[PDB]
Amino acid sequence: MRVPININNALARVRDPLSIGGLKFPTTKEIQEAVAAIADKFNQENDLVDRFFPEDSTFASELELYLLRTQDAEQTGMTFVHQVGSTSLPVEARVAKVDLAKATWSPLAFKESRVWDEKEILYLGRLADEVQAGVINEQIAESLTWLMARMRNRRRWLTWQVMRTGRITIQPNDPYNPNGLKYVIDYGVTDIELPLPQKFDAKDGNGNSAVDPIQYFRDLIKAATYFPDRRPVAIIVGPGFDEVLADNTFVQKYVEYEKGWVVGQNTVQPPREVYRQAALDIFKRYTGLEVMVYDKTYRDQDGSVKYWIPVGELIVLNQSTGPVGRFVYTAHVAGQRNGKVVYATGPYLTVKDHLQDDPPYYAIIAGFHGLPQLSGYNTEDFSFHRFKWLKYANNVQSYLPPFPPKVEL
Amino acid sequence: MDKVKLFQTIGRVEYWERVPRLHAYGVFALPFPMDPDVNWAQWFTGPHPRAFLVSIHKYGPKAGHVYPTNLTDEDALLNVIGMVLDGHDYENDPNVTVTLKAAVPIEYVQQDPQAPALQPHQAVLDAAEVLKLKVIKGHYFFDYTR
């Protein structure tokens, strides 16, 4: 939403009309003009999650899944012993069992509105130019585009909320909830977080560390051997992560093992920068976890830049890098194509003319129906180990350059 | 928790084999009227396989009707005639096939309907001589024809 101004006329009409104050006669002068654009460059959209939840859509509202399981009696037993010349004796009785199960899914709803009264539609001119009444026509298009982006933000918000906490939680204390509709949609992620009592950047005494990250992911892979779906593959960590590998004791000892840089005999001491320029590579080589990076930022209400992946935390994917289910829309109402109601599926946007009514007004309404769904579940147990979080360090902001303030002028 | 309910078990069906008898010993069965007074639907409840000793009315108004043997009354102990191996539906037939001469394990003789299955009932063993069941192994032996 820009100010309705013409920059050329406004930039020309500041120059003084008469203003002989200095020399008691008008002086000679030269004037150059230039405009400036001001924006916050560091408020980038959360592009990560749309790569991971694709968009399908069903006309029906609810989704249920039925799982038939079957346990059969395996061929147990041992053949009976007897003397030759005897009779024969019968075997015992065996047992097989059959169970079922039931899933349940149900969408949500979203809608919001605008309005423009008569004084706003009739009176709107540019701020310096002198034009007709034709500015509110250009002004409603920005509100149309803003409602479109405002719906994409709820798609990405729901999908980020389910990747962040497993459940998605709405409550009346929230900023963008006037209705106050409380929701706990527990998607049933089994172990959402990984335990670290002592974090990776935790040092006791004199430079000695506390835990070991490469060995931590090594025995996660080892202790998820016979669960072939808990065995991690990739990491997506945003901020400066090489420094946490470069300052702790054990990964420094692994870099010094690899490059042979014993401090008294081979070389004096390598700098910390030479550590961090290869610590991630030796980490990736000794584990095999392909680490992705995702360092986009959002300007929150503090005025302080924060990353999308919070500093000190890294996500862990547990079986593969791919779509973790999908985000699925449901159907809304579109009115009577022939004589009977025929629906539509995507996010809709409706315009309403009331320019004939008393007083004339004009309202645009957009919204949608939908909710994310986690497709692939475990079969024999009903678990879901696909993504996990862990908080790895506490002081990562000190490893980062500072951020500029927002220009409020 | 609210908009999405997860998996939850609805049904459970288990299925067993039958009550095994000895091939070498022989089977002999004669069908009998079921005594309508005793609650027969209690005796055929569970999916576990069982078998239960049956005594016949010698006389009275219900002479010929057979009922599950009560181990307290001697006039119900002496006139025992056999034991129903398989299982039966009293809601469709008042005429069960009582087996007279067979050889069934101790594990599968349960004289009470609430007695635990797959476990030897003790009062049948402590009344093994009155009921003329000879125990030589696990497997019982009975010939109520002779």
From Swiss-Prot, chain A:
Protein's UniProt keywords contain Glycosyltransferase: no
Family matches, as Pfam families: Phage_cap_E (PF03864)
Single GO cellular component term: host cell cytoplasm
Classification via InterPro entries: Major_capsid_GpE
Keywords: Capsid protein, Host cytoplasm, T=7 icosahedral capsid protein, Virion
Signal peptide: none
Source superkingdom: Viruses
Localization per record: Virion; Host cytoplasm
Tagged with keyword Plastid: no
Subunit structure: Homomultimer. Interacts with the portal protein. Interacts with the decoration protein.
Function comment: Assembles to form an icosahedric capsid shell with a T=7 symmetry although with a diameter of about 82 nm, which is a larger volume than the usual T=7 capsids. A dramatic reconfiguration of the capsid shell that expands the procaspid from a diameter of 66 nm to a supersized capsid of 82 nm, allows packaging of the large viral DNA genome. The capsid decoration protein binds the expanded capsid and stabilizes it.
Entry similarity comment: Belongs to the lambda phage major capsid protein family.
Protein name: Major capsid protein
Source species taxonomy: Viruses, Duplodnaviria, Heunggongvirae, Uroviricota, Caudoviricetes
UniProtKB/Swiss-Prot annotation, chain B:
Function: Cooperatively binds the expanded capsid, thereby stabilizing the mature capsid shell and allowing the large viral DNA to be packaged. Trimers of capsid decoration proteins molecules are located at local and icosahedral threefold axes and stabilize the expanded capsid, which shows increased spacing between capsomers.
Organism: Thermus virus P23-45
CC terms in the record's Gene Ontology section: viral capsid, decoration
Keywords on record: Capsid decoration protein, Capsid protein, Virion
Name used for this protein in its record: Decoration protein
Domain of life (superkingdom): Viruses
Organism classification: Viruses, Duplodnaviria, Heunggongvirae, Uroviricota, Caudoviricetes
Compartments in which it is found: Virion
Known partners and oligomeric status: Homotrimer. Interacts with the major capsid protein.
